[PDB]
Amino acid sequence: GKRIDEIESKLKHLEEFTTHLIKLMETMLELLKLVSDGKSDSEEYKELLEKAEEYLKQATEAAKKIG
Amino acid sequence: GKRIDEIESKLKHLEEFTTHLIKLMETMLELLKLVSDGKSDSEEYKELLEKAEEYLKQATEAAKKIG
Amino acid sequence: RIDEIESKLKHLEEFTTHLIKLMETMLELLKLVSDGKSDSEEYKELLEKAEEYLKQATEAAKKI
């Protein structure tokens, strides 16, 4: 089943994409929480921002692998 | 065995994942609108944060039920 | 059966594209939140682009 293998590969790439996406979503929720507490400009916000950017790049590569 | 059935289960769980994801993204966009208005400490912000956490949990479990 | 799964995967790919666009917009908005630019016009146009990407993602997810 060659078509089955193609579908399996696309689903694998979607799985890793959703993994990085969930990490990015937790990161953005924590960033919004820090905004709520008032620490809009703090080292925690910078670290979370860089982590969200790397998660977005990883998810972008994973979604590029699907096509 | 049941290969295409497993594929269909993955796709169904991904559909639920995308549904909760879109709810979460709407919540996040309203949160950032409130940030632009300066309601980062209001009660509406807290309710939206709670709803976003709920959507994040639902998306997390829906993506966990994919393997 | 297989054609249906392939159509589902195509719609999911469109969803992932619109989703990447929305995520980039949201991260740029969070950057604007830092350094104290929560009121700039860049924030406003980024909110507009985020609404557009969100509606595109909804249309793409309805096709699944």
Residue numbers in the entry:
A (entry chain B), B (entry chain C): 3 to 69
C (entry chain A): 5 to 68
The authors write:
Here we use deep network hallucination to generate a wide range of symmetric protein homo-oligomers given only a specification of the number of protomers and the protomer length. Starting from only a choice of chain length L and oligomer valency N (2 for a dimer, 3 for a trimer, etc.), the method carries out a Monte Carlo search in sequence space starting from a random sequence. The loss function guiding the search is computed by inputting N copies of the sequence into the AlphaFold2 (AF2) network, and combining structure prediction confidence metrics (pLDDT; per-residue structural accuracy, and pTM; an estimate of the TM-score) with a measure of cyclic symmetry (the standard deviation of the distances between the center of mass of adjacent protomers within the predicted structure). To eliminate such over-fitting, we generated new sequences for the HAL backbones using the recently developed ProteinMPNN sequence design neural network (accompanying manuscript: Dauparas et al.).
All crystal structures had the correct oligomerization state and closely matched the design models (median Cα RMSD of 0.6 Å across all designs, with resolutions ranging from 1.8 to 3.4 Å). The side chain conformations in the crystal structures also closely match those of the design models. HALC3_104 is a homo-trimeric coiled-coil, with a central bundle of three helices, augmented by an outer-ring of three shorter helices that lie in the groove formed by adjacent protomer (the closest matching structure in the PDB has a TM-score of 0.88).
